[PDB]
């Protein structure tokens, strides 16, 4: 489940992508 | 569309050129009908030229736009299609050892069953587990030879 907040940052790297 | 406007610029060019040459082998409609052609096809090439202007920025802003959108989905799916493989992979492990913890309680041994075979089987070697007990060794799961095989099974019951 701890990995699922490396997911969440994945949403942030979702974020950075976008630029 | 460039072959329309280069169509009517040549028919323009091509009319301004017979009417010149008819000018020069002399010292109208034909005049008019070349200036018009002509006029038309300078209001097409601003119009096209504006359009093919319009079109390429649009394009670029376009193709600009897809392709960020398009990267940034495709990362996130593929991001989220390598965590629900491990998360799948995690509830798969959990499921099988769910599945094989349930099999392990749910299911048991009886006791009295277990002395009754213990009290009836002390007699012959039919379930007794002996010293040199190994898998594949002369412990079987009959009583005797002639017990089960010529004793009332073979002849009593065939």
Redesign the interface.
Known sequence: LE??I??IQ?CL??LP??? | TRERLLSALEDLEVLSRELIEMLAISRENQVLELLIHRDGDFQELMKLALNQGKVHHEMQALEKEVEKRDSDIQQLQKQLKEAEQILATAVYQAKEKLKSIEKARKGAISSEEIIKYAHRISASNAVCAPLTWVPGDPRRPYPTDLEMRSGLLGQMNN
């Open positions: 990995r699922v490396e997911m994945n790297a979702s992508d976008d630029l």
